[PDB]
Design a binder for this molecule. Structure first.
Ligand SMILES: CCOP(=O)(COc1ccc(C[C@H](NC(=O)O[C@H]2CO[C@H]3OCC[C@H]32)[C@H](O)CN(CC(C)C)S(=O)(=O)c2ccc(OC)cc2)cc1)OCC
Lengths: 99, 99
């Protein structure tokens, strides 16, 4: 499909057996999801943007389905205000910018 | 053009007669540029990101050319980690997400 940018590009994702709304974010290197109790091991990490840095938990090889397109990669979990789908997963679903 | 996301979607912009590099950021509502001198009046404003809020200077109806495409809109200037082109201007240049 094609998504215009009049409004926030919010889509439904599926992760860890749960449906959520997430933002398709070409300005995000990595994927950052709201607090959730995913199973398995993780590693502490800090990511920064406007306003400073936040602490997150890095989970690897997590499967996410974005609009029916599957993707496997690293997911950061922490006190983010919004679920953010970053380039590490956007590339896997064939997402491009076009103008 | 069509832009893949294996690398950061960085493009050259021209604002106030000066060339800069900026990030096409579909997760940003607004356009935020690093500290710089712009002519005309400005109003102090605040915007919030992943790590909290920052103080910016709001410039309205500013000419800005993004990868050869002209836009006239709001540009925020402040201590952002990187120049980001947000949806307010991405819509003006006809930018969409596609997968
Ligand atoms: C009132 C303000 O609303 P809020 O609920 C913040 O809600 C957000 C936070 C972050 C994003 C993604 C980034 N957008 C954003 O900051 O937009 C700004 C500018 O326009 C406004 O619209 C949304 C918030 C303004 C951007 O797209 C990606 N960032 C990097 C970029 C700044 C270079 S990031 O989120 O900081 C990031 C993601 C993954 C990473 O992997 C290592 C690193 C960094 C969207 C909405 O309250 C704050 C306390």
């Amino acid at each position: 499909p094609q998504i215009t940018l009049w409004k926030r590009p919010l889509v439904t994702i599926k992760i860890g057996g749960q449906l959520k709304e997430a933002l398709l974010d070409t300005g995000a290197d990595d994927t950052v999801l709201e607090e959730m109790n995913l199973p398995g091991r993780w590693k502490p990490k800090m990511i920064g943007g406007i306003g400073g840095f936040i602490k997150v938990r890095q989970y690897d090889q997590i499967l996410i389905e974005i609009c029916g397109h599957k993707a496997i990669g690293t997911v950061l979990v922490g006190p983010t205000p919004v679920n953010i789908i970053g380039r590490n997963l956007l590339t896997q679903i064939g997402c491009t910018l076009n103008f």
